[PDB]
Q: What sequence folds into this?
């Protein structure tokens, strides 16, 4: 018929290979090594997480006796709460303030798709021609809404102010900078304003504000580097949360020039301009303060999970010896 | 001799309509073409479909080119696994349909309770909670579409085609002075060589040289297959005279019905098939044998001296009957293990991949949002989880070729059909459910709490999606690594290549360079560079990968320790 087959390792199924067999001496060590490495990692995360000092103030006020419950029926649009909270232990290092929204499905399919990416990138064509994905908020009356989409429209719009109540009892506002609270790439790559011009007023022709937004996307921040589509709060908001109960970076607190802690233990009052109604769908609103750690943030789940997986690893590791020993 | 250079239209027709999954994905294109229910982009199906369709076209274009040149100068059998694969694709449809309606009902109520009062989920379409629940039924068909494996078919021809070539190249199944190697002339009946139950053999021309004296190695080839629990029947000869004289020979050689004319030969084959529902392999030579060659599930044609006329009318046409040992014990046995390991992993790695949408359905209002990049669904089946299972389907060896001959008892694993049942389909389905649950909820718990929260915080959906995908890709590529027994340098390359190729591709997909080209199509710019530089995310991925692999390692270790398999028992004893 044809000449002899070519003689090669691959053709003859004789390639040099390693045959790993899960003997009792090769899979058992990785279990204890996993258990021996995971537990210290779990201990390190857990104790580090507990060393982070956090305080959360839930201020939506649905329940009675909360001293701004009037904001659920704001006959006058501007409503303000004033919640007093006390810090038992001072905060050391950089401190981040957040806002939390619960029972707020920011990850809804109709919600997530409702955004024009080319427009968010500063596209002249898509600026005046919103994607049909943001259909309900393409245009309001005669011209397209520049920040189209449900997400941009329904932007969290409270204003959380933190005050220090000293012995004299006169409130002392604390420093709070909104800059640099979003991903580096998002500010410089993913999100951009329309190109051209120097003043942002002249760069948005034929576009109205979103219906929900009280005022347009011109003067979100007085800083020219933080106004428009590249607004840090806006980018942080548009950066869709993975879950309904989520928390987003809102403000930074930097190390105080003095040797004293950034937030010394004492009495603090949270004065919030209540603008975001979330009580119809049973939404909660929170303000969270947290301090930086040399190993990420406060994640008791990961710390506890590593303790567990590191522990069941021993339980699996130790138990598997019994089976090995019995059936030697 | 079709493919007249203007005949690409019926190949897709043969690909699309004939195959149940192919036209479903075609019907799936229309489903996601209309924006009213389109929950995924059309890219998600075409790119895997064109690759799956394209590769199959290439494998068949070469076959017709040979026929054209053959005709230019001169001037149906289906595997047991094929039926099982066909049914399981339908089984995925009902499960896909059931879940889509189930999540639709959950979404319908969610709109009357939460969606209506949720002012942020207002879109202007005054759709009653019954209509929104109806529409999303199609949306959850589209999102969970990849529960139906898109590359299941094309991978099977690749495994079978490659396995057939090893028969051609086998120097051991090669005859010297006649210079006639083995030839697998059908490249779609491979795992069945490992599932053979009955052997039908002619005597004159196959068990002899026809020059008669028995053929060298037959007495030990006949005994070897018997030890592998394959019954041997001979339908040839002249009455008890020639029967017992050679029947008692060959180490007792069992039914020896002789005198059979070719009409009787094919008739007898059907008796075992219909009244026993078993797979049969027919081996013979000459015109009188071609009758059984067609009826039998596998047809073998010896070159012999009767005439080079029963080889082209068969499935495999090696030169000597003794070569039947390597065809089944080595090539057939490994093919079944390679195939079943492929399918067991293939359905798992799709269910473990798609079902993350189902778990993530409970935390997005049952709104049918993807938990991954839309471009991750495209390349997951063809790129990130294609080669390593393919290489395993070709190179995997539970035991060496020499050891497989010395242990014919390893064949019963195929006759009994133990490595891929209809039950083990659901175990791989459950294994996908748990892995998806782990692949989702462990990131969920980490993402519920603080996860690298600072100026650069991966607490978003896209990082949540990348983290789940990253843990998924490592898990499945480590899972296949746990599956392979023959770690060839190319097997290791494919497993780490797939993970490296995945991690390489995200950076290109998530780099700022590709964002400017297509801002809407590729929207995760910076996600990988931001999510994978955080130790908490990597601790999450390591924890997720570990907690979804160590239980597999522990279960695998227990299963072989408590109920050791035949392969493991001899693999432990190297000698
Ligand atoms: C802060 O955000 C909230 C939403 O979370 C804003 O409330 C929304 O205000 C818009 C008006 O800009 C409402 O749209 C329409 O207003 C007209 C009156 O101009 C009214 O007749 C319509 O029926 C409709 O309400 C929108 O409904 C309302 N949101 C809800 C849930 O009722 C609020 O104005 C924002 N405040 C600031 C200071 O940004
Ligand atoms: C909160 O503090 C302010 C100012 O210190 C005070 O006027 C008010 O009565 C306090 N309210 C409560 C409930 O402590
Ligand atoms: C709280 O903030 C508002 C807004 O700036 C301010 O008008 C008010 O005086 C502050 N103090 C209160 C409400 O006690
Ligand atoms: F003897 Al024969 F086919 F060769 F029955
Ligand atoms: Mg013959």
A:
């Amino acid at each position: 018929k044809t000449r002899r087959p070519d003689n090669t390792a691959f053709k003859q199924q004789r390639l040099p290979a390693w045959q790993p067999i899960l003997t009792a001496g090769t899979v058992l060590p990785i279990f204890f090594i996993i258990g021996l490495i995971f537990i210290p990692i779990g201990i390190g995360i857990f104790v580090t997480s507990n060393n982070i000092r956090e305080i959360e103030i839930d201020y939506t006020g649905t329940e009675p006796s909360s001293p701004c419950n009037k904001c659920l029926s704001p006959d006058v649009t501007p409503c303000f709460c004033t919640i007093n909270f006390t810090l038992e232990k001072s905060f050391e290092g950089n401190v981040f303030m957040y806002y939390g929204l619960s029972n707020f499905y920011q990850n809804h399919r109709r919600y997530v798709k409702s955004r024009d990416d080319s427009q968010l990138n500063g596209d002249s064509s898509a600026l005046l021609n919103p994607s049909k994905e943001c259909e309900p908020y393409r245009r309001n009356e005669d011209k397209p809404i520049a920040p189209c989409g449900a997400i941009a429209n329904s932007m969290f719009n409270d204003t959380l102010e933190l005050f220090l109540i000293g012995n004299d009892s006169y409130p002392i506002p604390i420093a709070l900078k909104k800059k640099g609270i979003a991903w580096w790439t998002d500010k410089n790559v993913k999100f951009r304003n329309p190109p051209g011009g120097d003043n942002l007023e002249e760069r948005f022709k034929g576009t109205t504000k979103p219906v929900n937004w009280l005022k347009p996307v011109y003067m979100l921040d007085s800083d020219p580097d933080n106004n428009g589509f590249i607004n840090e709060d806006f980018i942080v908001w548009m950066r869709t949360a993975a879950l309904p109960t989520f928390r987003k970076l809102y403000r930074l607190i930097e190390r105080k020039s003095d040797l004293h802690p950034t937030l010394p233990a004492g009495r603090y009052s949270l004065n919030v301009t209540y603008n975001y109604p979330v009580h119809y769908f049973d939404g909660r609103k929170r303000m969270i303060l947290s301090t930086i750690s040399w190993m990420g943030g406060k994640n008791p789940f990961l710390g506890i999970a590593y303790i567990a997986v590191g522990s069941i690893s021993f339980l699996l590791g130790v138990v598997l010896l019994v089976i090995n020993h019995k059936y030697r | 001799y079709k493919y007249n250079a203007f005949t690409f239209i019926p190949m897709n027709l043969f690909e699309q309509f004939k195959r149940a999954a192919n036209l479903y994905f075609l019907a799936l294109l229309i489903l996601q073409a209309v924006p009213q229910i389109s929950t995924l982009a059309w890219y998600t199906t075409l790119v895997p479909l064109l690759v799956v369709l394209g590769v199959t076209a290439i494998k068949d274009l070469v076959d017709d080119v040979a026929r054209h040149k053959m005709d230019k100068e001169i001037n149906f059998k289906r595997t047991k696994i094929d039926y099982l694969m066909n049914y399981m694709v339908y089984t995925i449809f009902v499960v896909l349909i059931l879940l889509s309606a189930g999540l639709a009902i959950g979404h319908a109520y969610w709109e009357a309770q939460v969606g209506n009062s949720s002012w942020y989920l207002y879109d202007g379409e005054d759709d009653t909670p019954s209509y929104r629940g109806f529409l999303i039924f199609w949306g959850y068909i589209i999102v969970l579409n990849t529960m139906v494996p898109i590359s299941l078919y094309v991978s099977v021809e690749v495994i079978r085609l490659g396995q057939s070539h090893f028969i051609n190249w086998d120097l051991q199944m090669y005859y010297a002075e006649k210079d006639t190697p083995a030839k697998a002339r059908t490249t779609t009946l491979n795992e069945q060589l490992g599932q053979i139950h009955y052997i039908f053999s002619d005597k004159t021309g196959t068990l002899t040289q026809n020059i008669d004296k028995l053929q060298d190695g037959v007495p030990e080839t006949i005994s070897k297959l018997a030890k592998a629990d394959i019954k041997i029947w001979v339908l040839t000869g002249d009455k008890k005279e020639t029967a017992e004289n050679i029947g008692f020979a060959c180490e007792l050689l069992a039914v020896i019905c002789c005198r059979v004319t070719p009409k009787q030969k094919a008739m007898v084959v059907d008796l075992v098939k219909r009244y026993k529902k078993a797979i049969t392999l027919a081996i013979g030579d000459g015109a009188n044998d071609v009758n059984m060659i067609k009826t039998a599930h596998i047809g073998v044609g010896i070159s012999g001296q009767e005439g080079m006329q029963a080889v082209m009318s068969s499935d495999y046409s090696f030169a000597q009957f003794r070569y039947l040992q390597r065809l089944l014990l080595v090539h057939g046995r490994w093919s079944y293990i390679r195939m079943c390991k492929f399918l067991r992993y293939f359905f798992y790695k799709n269910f473990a991949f798609t079902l993350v949408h189902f778990w993530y359905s409970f935390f997005n209002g049952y709104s049918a949002q993807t938990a991954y990049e839309d471009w991750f669904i495209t390349l997951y089946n063809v790129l990130y989880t294609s080669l390593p299972v393919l290489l395993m389907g070709l190179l995997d060896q539970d035991v060496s070729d020499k050891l497989s001959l010395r242990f014919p008892g390893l064949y019963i694993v195929g006759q009994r059909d133990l490595l891929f049942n209809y039950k083990r389909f659901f175990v791989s389905l459950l294994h996908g459910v748990l892995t998806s649950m782990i692949l989702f909820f462990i990131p969920l718990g980490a993402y519920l709490q603080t996860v690298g929260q600072d100026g650069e915080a991966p607490s978003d959906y896209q990082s949540f999606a990348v983290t789940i995908a990253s843990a998924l890709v490592i898990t499945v590529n480590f899972q296949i690594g746990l599956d392979t027994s023959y770690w060839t340098f190319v097997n290791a390359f494919s497993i780490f290549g797939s993970i490296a190729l995945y991690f390489g591709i995200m950076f290109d997909f998530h780099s700022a360079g590709i964002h400017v080209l297509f801002p809407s199509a590729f929207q995760f710019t910076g996600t990988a560079s931001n999510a994978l530089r955080q130790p908490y995310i990597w601790l999450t991925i390591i924890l997720t990968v570990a907690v979804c692999l160590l239980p597999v390692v522990a279960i695998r270790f227990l299963s072989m320790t408590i109920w050791p398999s035949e392969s493991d028992k001899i693999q432990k004893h190297r000698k």
